[PDB]
Design a binder for these strands. Structure first.
Ligand code: MG
Ligand code: MG
Ligand code: MG
Ligand code: MG
Ligand code: MG
Ligand code: MG
Ligand code: MG
Ligand code: MG
Ligand code: MG
Length: 207
RNA sequence: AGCUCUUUCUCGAUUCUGUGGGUGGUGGUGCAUGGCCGUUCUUAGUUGGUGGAGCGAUUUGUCUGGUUAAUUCCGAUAACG
């Protein structure tokens, strides 16, 4: 937003640079060109943070406008985003899908997995292409976290970030939960949040 | 074989004559058919409902790979059941 209550604070830029979310890929595509600051001395692109923040608050403003919280289905297929989507759906009452997608869940009126969402959030356009291709049949908008080499086909609100590393992905889902819960009422601003981002990170099997 | 011929007793309305019409047939057609059987074919093969691809005949599901006597399973997965 244009305001000052919605502006990025110094405590969040440290969370960003600590998770590494500013660090892009090696290849750029001509649709993500407005989100890049400059290519490093070695071949890697820096993502502009102020632009990440504005696209993240636009996604939150798109999610808050849906009345029933339970038709904002969230999807992750890679192993890094499963815990994050499960915790995001818990914190704000969406319906998560981790693992395989079982094509036809959006367009098949027999299956027991058939639902009719009203939004669609997704971790990675290039790894969860089946939900996008199916959303392209039932008038279904889409929000997506994009790496610097993400194809922006059928996505409607791309959020630029490092999409590869587990810490980055969990931090982005945590911040998306923070800002929907903030502007819906609920956990009012001028307080830190009870949950720490590490509840949202990938497990990466332990000792 | 009263089959027929010579001869002339016996039976009793059941027949006989003619016209229609039936009846029977190990007669014809298995290239008019039912049913049964044999064989393709002793192997692992077949099919539709909703969804996806194609203008369409069609295709996916019914599979790269491993496994099994086996489309038997494990799995992979625009398919689900
Ligand atoms: Mg006859
Ligand atoms: Mg006969
Ligand atoms: Mg015959
Ligand atoms: Mg016959
Ligand atoms: Mg069809
Ligand atoms: Mg068609
Ligand atoms: Mg077939
Ligand atoms: Mg064998
Ligand atoms: Mg299986």
């Amino acid at each position: 937003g244009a305001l000052d209550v919605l502006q990025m604070k110094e405590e969040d830029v440290l969370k960003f640079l600590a998770a590494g979310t500013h660090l892009g890929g090696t290849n750029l595509d001509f649709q993500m060109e407005q989100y890049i600051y400059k290519r490093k001395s070695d071949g890697i692109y820096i993502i502009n943070l102020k632009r990440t923040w504005e696209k993240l608050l636009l996604a939150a403003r798109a999610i808050v406008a849906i009345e029933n919280p339970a038709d904002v289905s969230v999807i992750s297929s890679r192993n890094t985003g499963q815990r994050a989507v499960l915790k995001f759906a818990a914190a704000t009452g969406a319906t998560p899908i981790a693992g395989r997608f079982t094509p036809g869940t959006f367009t098949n009126q027999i299956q027991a997995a058939f639902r009719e969402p009203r939004l669609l959030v997704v971790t990675d356009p290039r790894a969860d292409h089946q939900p996008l291709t199916e959303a392209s049949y039932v008038n279904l908008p889409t929000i997506a976290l994009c790496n610097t080499d993400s194809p922006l086909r059928y996505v409607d609100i791309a959020i630029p970030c490092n999409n590869k590393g587990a810490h980055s992905v969990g931090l982005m889902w945590w911040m998306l939960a923070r800002e929907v819960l903030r502007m819906r009422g609920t956990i009012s601003r001028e307080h830190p949040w009870e949950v720490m981002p590490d509840l949202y990170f990938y497990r990466d099997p332990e000792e």
